[PDB]
Paper text:
Here, we report a new X-ray crystal structure of [name] bound to A-419259 in which the activation loop and αC-helix are fully resolved. The structure was determined at 1.8 Å resolution and revealed the autoinhibited state, with the SH3 and SH2 domains bound intramolecularly, while the kinase domain adopts the DFG-in/αC-helix-out conformation reported previously with A-419259. The kinase crystallized in the closed conformation with the SH3 domain interacting with the SH2-kinase linker and the SH2 domain bound to the C-terminal tail phosphotyrosine. The SH2 domain engages the tail phosphotyrosine with the positively charged side chain of Arg175 in the phosphotyrosine binding pocket of the SH2 domain forming a salt bridge with the pTyr527 phosphate group in the C-terminal tail. While both inhibitors occupy nearly identical positions within the active site, A-419259 has a much more extended structure than PP1, with a cyclohexylmethylpiperazine group that contacts Asp348 and a methylphenoxybenzene moiety that extends further into the hydrophobic pocket. A-419259 induces an extended activation loop conformation with the tyrosine autophosphorylation site facing away from the active site and into the solvent. In the kinase domain, the complete αC-helix and activation loop are clearly visible with the autophosphorylation site (Tyr416) extending outward from a short α-helix. We propose that this preferred A-419259 conformation represents a unique intermediate between active and inactive conformations of [name] and possibly other Src-family kinases, while PP1 induces a more fully downregulated kinase domain structure.
Author numbering: 80 to 114, 116 to 255, 257 to 531
The structure:
Amino acid sequence: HHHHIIVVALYDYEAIHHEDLSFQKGDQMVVLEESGEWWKARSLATRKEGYIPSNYVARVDSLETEEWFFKGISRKDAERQLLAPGNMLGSFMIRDSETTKGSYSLSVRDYDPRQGDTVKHYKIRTLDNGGFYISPRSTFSTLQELVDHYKKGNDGLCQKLSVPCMSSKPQKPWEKDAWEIPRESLKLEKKLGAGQFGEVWMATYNKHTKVAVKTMKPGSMSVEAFLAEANVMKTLQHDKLVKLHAVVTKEPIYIITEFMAKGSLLDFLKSDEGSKQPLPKLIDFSAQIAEGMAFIEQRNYIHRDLRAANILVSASLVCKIADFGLARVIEDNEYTAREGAKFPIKWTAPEAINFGSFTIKSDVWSFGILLMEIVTYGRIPYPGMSNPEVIRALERGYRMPRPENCPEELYNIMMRCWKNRPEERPTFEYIQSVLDDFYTATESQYEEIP
Ligand SMILES: CN1CCN([C@H]2CC[C@@H](n3cc(-c4ccc(Oc5ccccc5)cc4)c4c(N)ncnc43)CC2)CC1
């Protein structure tokens, strides 16, 4: 009923809107209301009221207040964060277990010549009368005691704990209730590119926030159809999908999203920087997209144009799916027809080309082609073949051969994605599983330390 949760700032926040409350790390507050990413709160110190970023604060009695506790992180994202540049041997984090509810997991950066950079996971068990342990000989009253113990010595661990995994201030939340925004709120600063049905620009919103704006050409979309689809796209909240912040519901329609500093995955892989990414990183890029596409599958949605051109890359090298569902709202009329085909033949499933049958299974086919794009660093699919040759070849059972530097398991995934019958193709859930655990035939999941 009432709101009795007291929170403390995990970072400083300077108000940029109207009803937002500014605060500094340590400042404690009372949550008066939970309105999503924004929470109405009261300063325990200066009595001031106002909205605060929910991701910048934590319950005062929580482990979320600790530098080494990572709340709401998956085993995979912990591995990716720990293996990120700027972390050292023994870098570590404690997180909520994904296998045993109420219990915790210790993730540590390790290095072996034969294995390379690795992340080892330890199960922190809870004691019934209070306390925690990884090995029965070593029990602790608190998790801080456990950390300090393993920071003094490995005591069975792969490495002595060094420093907490590095973290950065999270993204500031988009303004409360600013979905359909005025066009004058946006200053278009640099055109990033121009396509068949519109352009993309880097811009500033209300002088305070950098964003990307997809500007759709007049005649490309109905305002009402677009807004209905956009209201669904807004619900597709997942870390591997580009964040849609707002829209201008007047022709020319604008779609405002977070800015992704490294552009398209296609351009990145063809870049001097991306060409140097090792195969394990390429498989991780693939798994990131598979996680996003598994979410879209669980939500009964369809991308309709999956390809490296439609994957965006952050400065932190995180891949995020873009243009999910957009092809459904690009109308087929006299205006768009001049721009040429909406779908790239070499990425499109045969049933979609021949009958317009677009489903999650046609996305699976496209994901297979995207996997080949990634392992080939952006090479055109079906090298040496025109679009007409590809369609007739696919009808005769032709499939792209395994490229160099392509693990056979990855190629096998591609082949399954390219089954002619959509029902015989794998689920994104399966694809995500195989890719997330590609190098984990180690089994055990955790470490069995005595
Ligand atoms: C040769 N190159 C030249 C550069 N081209 C680039 C043109 C714009 C780039 N680009 C595009 C985007 C982008 C922006 C909005 C968008 O709209 C939707 C998002 C989700 C669901 C539905 C619609 C989709 C994509 C982008 C970005 N956010 N942040 C940073 N860069 C971004 C992506 C590639 C690509 C080809």
